[PDB]
Write a protein that binds this ligand. Structure first.
Ligand SMILES: [Cl-]
Ligand SMILES: [Cl-]
Length: 112
């Protein structure tokens, strides 16, 4: 498995705006999960949507775009406190279980 890429490296938005990173990942034929983390990593959202646990309400979304390779990692109503660094991590579920991380990207949320 190849690592995913995560862009843009720096995203600056105003508080109250949405913010969207793009994770790009070229899969093999094997099952995978793509996690979005805020960086100890904190998992914000995943693709596919997790069906092993009950649904959760969230400002964070991961969506696979129709080209399959790109994924939007979005925050709604960004707050000053959302400023920080983030990454996406691909987990191969076969033939070997492994995680490969993108480089980090920074979100800067500026005052209104
Ligand atoms: Cl990257
Ligand atoms: Cl899904």
């Amino acid at each position: 498995m190849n690592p995913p890429t995560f862009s843009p490296a720096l995203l600056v938005v105003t508080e109250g705006d949405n913010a969207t990173f793009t994770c790009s990942f070229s899969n093999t034929s094997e099952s995978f999960v793509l996690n979005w983390y805020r960086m100890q990593p904190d998992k914000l959202a995943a693709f596919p949507e997790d069906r092993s646990q009950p649904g959760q309400d969230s400002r964070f979304r991961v969506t696979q775009l129709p080209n399959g390779r790109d994924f939007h990692m979005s925050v709604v109503r960004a707050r000053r406190n959302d400023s920080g660094t983030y990454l996406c991590g691909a987990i191969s579920l076969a033939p070997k279980v492994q995680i490969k991380e993108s480089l980090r990207a920074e979100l800067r949320v500026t005052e209104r």
